[PDB]
């Protein structure tokens, strides 16, 4: 709070990082220098994390608010001239000038936060937008010349930049030359500003000739008229320069600009530049790390030779070996001659994971790919192969654009040779080697970030060699310190540029280079005496940086190894670097193995331990255990599963006798169990052999036998019924892992899951001492009959006694108890393990805990008397924290036909009340308003009131007032119903009851219509009813007052629904006014004022049940919980937006209001209004009148009439009408709306990806659940983050198929919805996201089915408002993959394709309700 003002744990570290990022670009140099040091002191595991940054979000919102505002027109021509002069020439002609310009442009007569006025990024963005506004509002009559002069100016500059990009030897003036180190950074800044200006200009022109909807204000009539007649020229110019814009964007390291331009160019090609365009777009996507988009483009282009695109996608995923091999194969097949080089075995590498320009691109990609993994030998061999191929084919164009001198220098440096390294470095450009500091970068340097990175690396190498030679303290140290300081000052440029635009992430290469420079600067001055000289890249990044490549690890290792070797030249005490080196090498090896890089992984393992499959088994078979586990994993990834399993077993045997062996034993056992489960068919024999040997062999079997037989529960008697022999080994392994590490929750969860899955089947199928006991207690056929009756199907005691008496004609009780106890042993063990796992979580995923709680509840509900001593005692000590996700389920089970069960549930709820009463307050209070379901609620309310009785009394009064605020409406409804059914005793009774029920607002209503009783009495012995109804209807034709319809203040009651709130916000006030919406049943839109001064709107609904909506929301939350793991290594989060609903009785209810979401129908309405205005220049029809206007003549043409039923309607006529309607509406509504709402191309890419992922997740959820009536008004969109939200949920669970006009599409997928996903459509990120969502749902379908089953058996849920059983069966069939055919089970890909085809075909869209508006 103290920081980021006008005056000059991981949770706190994240905020600190965001603050430092925002302050990185500040007007004052002292602030930037101060925050840079703080940023450098934060570990990379937090700096490179994918957490959200609210600081950048504030700037984005401020900019969005400024653009959405109406134009100011205060920008003078001189300001624009100065801005353009600085952008195109570097001279600003003004000597904190941005702030002065902004202040001068503002007007007092006619709202960016003041604290944000000190950031240069905000000022630059504002200036660029203002300049674009001035250029557009002036009809292109800027001081740069005429309307065409500007076009030629920017066109020439862009063409020159593109030419330089193709040939780096052009050296364009004013762009590649600088007088010092500041000019070089200014060049990149100017280039970025130019790209932003072009994007803004295009957006403004589009808005001028077409228009937006609630995003940007419409320009004057003159501007619209001028841009409408000249849109063709603008479009032609943009299309002509789009080819060069992409190249310029690629040179500036801004893949978003080139990606957007490429998509637009591809879309415009509606009728030899296609290959280059596709290749360039693929390159940009690869730079953005988006393999899904590349795959989608490849599939899209396959319908128009381009099989190499998929290969590039592999490189975008982090796989370098496979990518290089594929590139070589493609080049060999395209050229006609052999071009492959020596590498790892293809059979193992694959198992682990014709134009002159295409060949050059593939060769360059292969070279860069080999350089990324730091394979100098491979690079040299590749160079020789390329030279030989070029000489044997006379290509004359196949050249590698990679500085070989730099590669040789790096090779010599990493090889320990410093003399040769210095000799090679002497030939590189830049300042000479240390023996002037303000100008270190050389001249003629291009603005490409790659060149800057190369220069920084060269400087670092020069400093390292200088220090090494100087070592063998103020002689050769001051110069090195100054050199390193300047190097660190130059490497901060990329971070500032990244912060200039809303990126939400920082460059990895630049950050690593900056940290390396800082480490070198600290080690030179301290001579390796402080812990600050080491790179902060620790192993903690394993669980927080899974979305990055292995490149940063190699960069860090490059200097870590150098420091390690340099340690031998220091005699004084030094810090321990061996541990850091081991940690870095191990983590890098893990990252490499997780992507198929077997060669690099083996190299790292060999380095830490100090091309054939048989070589690995002969070279590998505090960090000890981790190293062994990594070796086993590497061997497994190479295909040698047998050797890997044997090594793991051998390592676990030794770990079982170690000192600590806490986290290593559990990992070595769980991994082995998982691998054994994978190859169940090939390990069944070995497991059976082990089991047979246990009661009386391969190396793995003999090694596992000693592991399970390790001296210090599961007996062979309890598993001798329906349990297979190989499964016993897995159970024993889980038990061993649990007893060997009681502090690991996974060791208990695995055992509990195994025990439960086996016990369920054992009890289901079950529905020598025993014989001896029965014979002794009953001192031939009689014995057999008694034995069979005792265990026949074990009000049960009476039935068993009667059966035994009828068969034989008392010691059978003991035998029955023993057998029932033996059959349920699995459940007892599972319950104990689950209780221990829950107690250890007072470290695991939320879903992992929800499943356990649901299983325990299901067991206690189904089997209560069979296992009571376990659950009764466990529930009395289980913590209340992991039981906050199934509260409604606990309340719904308060009527179980059991005494102790209800008592235990009540006790658990009471315990949960303490320290968390804001979660079970509303349900209990509402429930209190037979005796089995009443005493529980009364006791819970009393227990909750024992702490704060005032809060309970106040909440009760509030609930009563809300219920009483749900008179005129009731009278009008009753009168209408009576009049409709008029055409007696029933009417008289109803009128009397209504009058009796009616006995501020009430006083006025009575004083105004108190003659109703007299009129009814007089008419009893009928115009009075009609007159009253007419008067009520006339007076009905919205705004109320809380005071007149009491109002409390300073309350201490929690808000209506705060499950996801660590600190509850007590209600402070209530809205003074209430609005009534016109959507069907009259709803009351109220507002609440919390303690935190925030405003929370709510929608109060009456006379309708809302218990199903709560269950649906809970199900959605449970589903969203399953995406916690996948969201830790993916930029676009997998989320399902949903609100909260809280019923207030049988027919009342309160629903949370979601702000910031705009319905999709608004865009169509605005477009219709714009079209109508345009047509009138030289209301709008409803979705029902317009449809009939076309269905009338069409039906009359064939001979039919409109009087015919909709069922007997030709399909061709409907298809023709639908096609005619689709050709009128344009598909650029949502696509252009989202584009205009964003601020920068980088933000546009993020918004588009988020929208695609959200749409895919929502579509899959709706299809699985069965959501219907998905019209435009029922779908909302969040433009700030581009997310899809759904509100209405009345039509669900396949209810739409039984309506008057059935629906066949599973989800809504129309022209605009599909067009907003990109040029590819549903073949890119959409299909992959849908497949991933289905995979996740299929993996965790057990918990979903259990939750649905619990929802079915709910006395407070009204389904008809065996239907529930049918719904559950349908959901189960859909989740299992047997929705279309129950005999064959389709795969995830097949199901996704079938659903997409069914939702995208025109046959189903033609026959649909006109209200769904399928033509948009
Ligand atoms: C352009 C006009 N609008 C769109 C229609 S809007 O309403 O004005 C509007 C709404 C929001 N945001 C928002 N947030 C939360 C909820 C709702 C909402 C709205 C209406 N109905 C429900 C509803 C009704 C019934 C049931 N349940 C059953 O039917 N049976 C059990 C469940 C839910 C929920 N809306 C944002 C902007 C705008 Cl414009
Ligand atoms: O070996 P680690 O580096 O510790 O990573 C493993 C494992 O990675 P591997 O697939 O390479 O074996 C899995 O990580 P992801 O695949 O999800 O990225 C994950 O679980 P899965 O194997 O089911 O995917 C989990 O292993 P576990 O199943 O035991 O939770 C994890 O860390 P741990 O092995 O330490 O738990």
Author numbering: 766 to 773, 791 to 877, 881 to 895, 900 to 1060, 1067 to 1099, 1103 to 1151, 1178 to 1259, 1269 to 1305, ...
Sentences from the paper on this structure:
SMG1 is a member of the phosphatidylinositol-3-kinase-related kinase (PIKK) family, which also includes the ATM, ATR, DNA-PKc, and mTOR kinases. Despite the confounding name reflecting a possible evolutionary origin with a lipid kinase, and in retrospect the ability of some PIKK family members to bind inositol-6-phosphate, all active PIKKs are Ser-Thr protein kinases. These large, multidomain enzymes share an overall similar architecture: a C-terminal catalytic module (comprising the so-called FAT, kinase, and FATC domains) and an N-terminal α-solenoid (that typically serves as a protein-protein interaction module). SMG8 and SMG9 form an unusual G-domain heterodimer.
While many of the SMG1 residues interacting with SMG1i are conserved within the PIKK family, two contact sites appear to be specific: SMG1 Pro2213 and Asp2339 contact the sulfonamide moiety of the inhibitor while Asn2356 forms hydrogen bonds with the phenyl urea/carbamide group. Superposition of the SMG1 active site in the SMG1i-bound structure with the active site of mTORΔN shows that the corresponding residues have diverged and would not be able to mediate analogous interactions with the SMG1i sulfonamide group (mTOR Thr2245 and Ser2342 at the positions of SMG1 Pro2213 and Asp2339) or with the urea group (mTOR Gly2359 at the position of SMG1 Asn2356). Taken together, these observations rationalize the specificity of SMG1i for SMG1 over mTORΔN that we observed in the in vitro assays. In the case of ATR, the SMG1i sulfonamide site has diverged (Gly2385 at the position of SMG1 Pro2213) and residues in the N-lobe would result in a steric clash with the urea group of the inhibitor (Lys2329 and Asp2330 corresponding to SMG1 Leu2157 and Glu2158). Finally, mTOR, DNA-PK, and ATR active sites have a different relative orientation of the kinase N- and C-lobes as compared to SMG1, changing the overall chemical environment at the SMG1i-binding site.
